[PDB]
Amino acid sequence: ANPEHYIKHPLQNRWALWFFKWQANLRLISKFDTVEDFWALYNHIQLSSNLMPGCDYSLFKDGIEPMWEDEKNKRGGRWLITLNKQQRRSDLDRFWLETLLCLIGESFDDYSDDVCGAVVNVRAKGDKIAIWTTECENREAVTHIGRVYKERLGLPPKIVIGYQSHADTATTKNRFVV
């Protein structure tokens, strides 16, 4: 039966979508905490592939700013996916959507609590996507998140991805690899 009042399906966490065009240029677009509200937001906004050079989207848990200096990010780091310039057409939007689904779906088992959010950088040199985690020394969590994320994106067996601490990016060698 189609009810007169449809009840949405609540997500484990509330999420906030951000847009970058330094801390002046950040802008909170929208927040959501149901699956249906996620889809309504995703359906309405521009694809990452259609953004201007130097823009970012970020999706982070409610109350975490998408910046190194936030308390949940300070000690953390990121699993970085680097795309080449040709991959903008074939892979960018596809990888970004799947990243969003890994986040809102809590796809990393017990270690989804370590996940702070994700960022996509739209750049002329080549696009970048990253999952940001809260603590770079949580080796078991960082390792599990990396393996699952890489395999969810369907990245070639040949290529390796790397985890950088935000500390080493701020002063970059890989702290972990999968």
């Binding site: 699956v35 779906g105 809590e106």
Partner: peptide, 12 residues
Amino acid sequence: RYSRLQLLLLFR
């Protein structure tokens, strides 16, 4: 809470 399948199922 939700599998990948369930998230997509709820895109209407």
